[PDB]
Design a protein around this ligand. Sequence first.
Ligand SMILES: *C1O[C@H](CO)[C@@H](O)[C@H](O)[C@H]1NC(C)=O
Ligand SMILES: *[C@@H]1O[C@H](CO)[C@@H](O)[C@H](O)[C@H]1NC(C)=O
Ligand SMILES: [Ca+2]
Ligand SMILES: [Cu+2]
Ligand SMILES: [Cu+2]
Ligand SMILES: [Cu+2]
Ligand SMILES: [Cu+2]
Ligand SMILES: [Cu+2]
Ligand SMILES: [Cu+2]
Ligand SMILES: [Cu+2]
Ligand code: NA
Ligand code: NA
Ligand code: NA
Ligand SMILES: [O]
Length: 1029
Amino acid sequence: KEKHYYIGIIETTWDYASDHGEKKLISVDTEHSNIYLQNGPDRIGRLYKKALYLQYTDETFRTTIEKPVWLGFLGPIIKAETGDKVYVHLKNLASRPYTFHSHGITYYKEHEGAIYPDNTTDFQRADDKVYPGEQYTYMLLATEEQSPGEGDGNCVTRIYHSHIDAPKDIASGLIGPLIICKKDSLDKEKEKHIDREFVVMFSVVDENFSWYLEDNIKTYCSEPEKVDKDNEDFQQSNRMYSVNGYTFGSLSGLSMCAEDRVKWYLFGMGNEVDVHAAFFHGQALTNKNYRIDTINLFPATLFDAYMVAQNPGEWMLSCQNLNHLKAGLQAFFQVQECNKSSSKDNIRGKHVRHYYIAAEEIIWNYAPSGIDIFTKENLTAPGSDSAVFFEQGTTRIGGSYKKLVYREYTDASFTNRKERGPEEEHLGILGPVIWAEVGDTIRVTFHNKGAYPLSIEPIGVRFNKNNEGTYYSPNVPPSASHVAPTETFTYEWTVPKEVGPTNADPVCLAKMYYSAVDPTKDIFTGLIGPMKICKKGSLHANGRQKDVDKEFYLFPTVFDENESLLLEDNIRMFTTAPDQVDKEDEDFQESNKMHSMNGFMYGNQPGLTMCKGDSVVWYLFSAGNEADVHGIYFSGNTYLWRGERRDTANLFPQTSLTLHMWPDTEGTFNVECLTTDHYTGGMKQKYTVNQCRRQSEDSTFYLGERTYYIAAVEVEWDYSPQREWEKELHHLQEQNVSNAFLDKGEFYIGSKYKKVVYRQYTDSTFRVPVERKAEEEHLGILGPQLHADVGDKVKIIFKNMATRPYSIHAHGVQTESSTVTPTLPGETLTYVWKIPERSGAGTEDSACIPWAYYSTVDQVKDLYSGLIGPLIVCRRPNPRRKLEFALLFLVFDENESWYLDDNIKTYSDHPEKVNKDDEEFIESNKMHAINGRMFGNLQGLTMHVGDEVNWYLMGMGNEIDLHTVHFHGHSFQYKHRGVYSSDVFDIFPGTYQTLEMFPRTPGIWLLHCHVTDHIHAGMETTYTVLQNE
Ligand SMILES: *C1O[C@H](CO)[C@@H](O)[C@H](O)[C@H]1NC(C)=O
Ligand SMILES: *[C@@H]1O[C@H](CO)[C@@H](O)[C@H](O)[C@H]1NC(C)=O
Ligand SMILES: [Ca+2]
Ligand SMILES: [Cu+2]
Ligand SMILES: [Cu+2]
Ligand SMILES: [Cu+2]
Ligand SMILES: [Cu+2]
Ligand SMILES: [Cu+2]
Ligand SMILES: [Cu+2]
Ligand SMILES: [Cu+2]
Ligand code: NA
Ligand code: NA
Ligand code: NA
Ligand SMILES: [O]
């Protein structure tokens, strides 16, 4: 099929909230919509000039093909099937230059529609700047390499947008869907055996970034002269939390029949605030044949889900990022009776699990011992990081808060409790486990003994409209939505086969419950609890899983006590001077942000104990906002998840995960969040693995032995040795051109910083560094790429050539002991890393998987000072050339380096003028690099057509280190045998991933994180595909 589309870019008004009316939303209180939507002398309002893609019939762009009402401002849906040749005839009827750049489809440099320094000449540059009145025809081929995977649906979510300044072009409104499908998937532009196809973009559409910001300020503001574009409140008012451009519940036309087979194409778009949690209330979806209910989306995350629509009524599609929810990121959809036909389960009443739970106020100490169990230091030590959170005095609450927690009782009398045992000691602030099997019916008698109205809203089970735990709509006594301060309601949930684990899932799936009267306050108050939905006949009568020694529930979150219903109470109860407290003081707000695991902090979480050999299942879930970017690292052990070997689990708002671990080493290890602020703020705990069998004289399998000589060495590191690529890009872009990170100006540091980094040496004398070859030029700041095979004992001979104590240690790897010995300056130590089966690929991994190696002495500062490398572990005992590249996506926060003072003194032209606490100086030191290089300074990513390339992506860092790695020109495949495919991979702290690529098309191709703030900050480079012979 040759397909021909005619897309034109017109400027036009967009209404973000096309009333009409009139609504009640979750957690938005009537008189709040108008922060974003109300026209004032100072405020644009709900109407904006935007550049939009429209579809036309004709090379004579005159009569438009109307687009679905639910698309909103997204451009027209383009589709293609493996084999197809799509011709996108673009015509610019707007006032400035734009392009059409497509994801997930093959093009030559003439048809990429993206401008950047690629050493192309004019023939291959017409695509990259289509001027007003110009017209360009993009030839896109749907190659085999870009097609959906074996393990994928028939169709996957892709996107197109303009790419001169992509972030700005997209904010201005030039973004749209491409659905790519397998060969004979489609009949008349619709998937065979699918009834409805919707496309949904979650984005905080930031009109501050639009090309038309100024035009819009003139048009809509009565006092333009009075508008400060840098006023924070002005900026917020132009942030349109929307799905498809529709804000506050106004998305129109999402309608379907019960039993319709619905395929949803979702994607996220935007910036660091775009931590999305897409959640279809009342319904049940699969993704890659797995049961899911929340779909997390980030800038350019591409995601597809299947839904058999059921449980008829009016439901919400919401973002469960609590900030997004309360900023109104909500859309209604309709499941109607028509009349069906089928039904299938049935079971609503037969086998009944009955729970008696009460909300009641306790005084929760986040750290009972008063000590940091990790350091033995105590938490109020003046000047300590913990002090910020545990200091108690004039205007500071400290470490104990009144909270409203769920607690279990034996029966409807609520006269006596179901006490907690050993198995339940780790739950802390969590409520009681609710568990159920496919076929059960859950009835929950909820009795509120708190001063505020609460509810229970479960994720993971089916319930009907008058059992729903939250209230929303498009139009005395107690109900599912409202259970007031002394009342009592009894919920009824069902768990049919349609809502439980699937064949691919494990036996049980981590889920959760919370109070959703106002979930943006209720959860943080304490009303969160763990839940466990399992397959038929999988649990024993007592709830425990068959052949499972231990079951743990971890809930990591920044418990934001500023948002608790009980804030005022806690101020009045714990501060010396309640009247002197400003709830809006940032330092006051920080003091209330309790970074915790199950409400415990700084290693105070008890009850995480097990035997070596035990079968352990970890149920993890989280809630919160954009700050809740978690990487939960089990030091000393790995786990399987969907057949993947990993040791760090990423959680976002309303994420749930089920990990299986079999601990193989006696000791006391760490479960900790690697997200550097969370770690520092006390999101860290211990778990003990005890020796419960006779030791046995063992270690009788070493298929291999390796020694590496590595040194920590202090060096001048330049993030941007040259600035030509940058200067060229901004010229092409017509931009200008303060660089906050590289421009020294009056007194800033610039691009060069003293750092400490890992380097390989030839032998134990450490006199002679291993020469970095052409194929390892790309490593950049990274230490050497260490290789190991499953079965190896790897000796690391480590010399600390730097001026303070450091260590070397690896993820995934097994060692003799839970402790890692620091090695002092001048000293050489030996570390032994064993590589058992569980340090290598799972059933469903690629043959080679990466692990980060790093320094344990101070994990935050040692990392930002520059100590970080890749260990690659491989399975097993004519074809193509096989290449390897390792990529760290990390904002090197040079403010946290040990060498900061050294650097201020060495590079600043006026050291005295530097204030370390000044925001502007802090930004100047946040180096948004790939492998320690910015703006195209990462060299040596070269390959030939026909090669197989393993890309080892590695992410570390802080809350803002969510990186959405995108490759121009080619997509990749992932997982055993290449069964999922994409061209954007999401990387967070702790995420290490192999992606296989089979490059076809010659060129120099852009490779960049797709987060607005990171692209502009320079987190990008190019890679080169060369033709043959
Ligand atoms: C630790 O020392 C602090 C220092 O001010 C002291 O006041 C406190 O009692 C100690 N903490 C505990 C509970 O051990
Ligand atoms: C672009 O061309 C310059 C000058 O000929 C050359 O030195 C450089 O290798 C090229 N850049 C890339 C990314 O290949
Ligand atoms: Ca081009
Ligand atoms: Cu893109
Ligand atoms: Cu969101
Ligand atoms: Cu975290
Ligand atoms: Cu990024
Ligand atoms: Cu792209
Ligand atoms: Cu791009
Ligand atoms: Cu940034
Ligand atoms: Na606005
Ligand atoms: Na506090
Ligand atoms: Na800098
Ligand atoms: O792309």
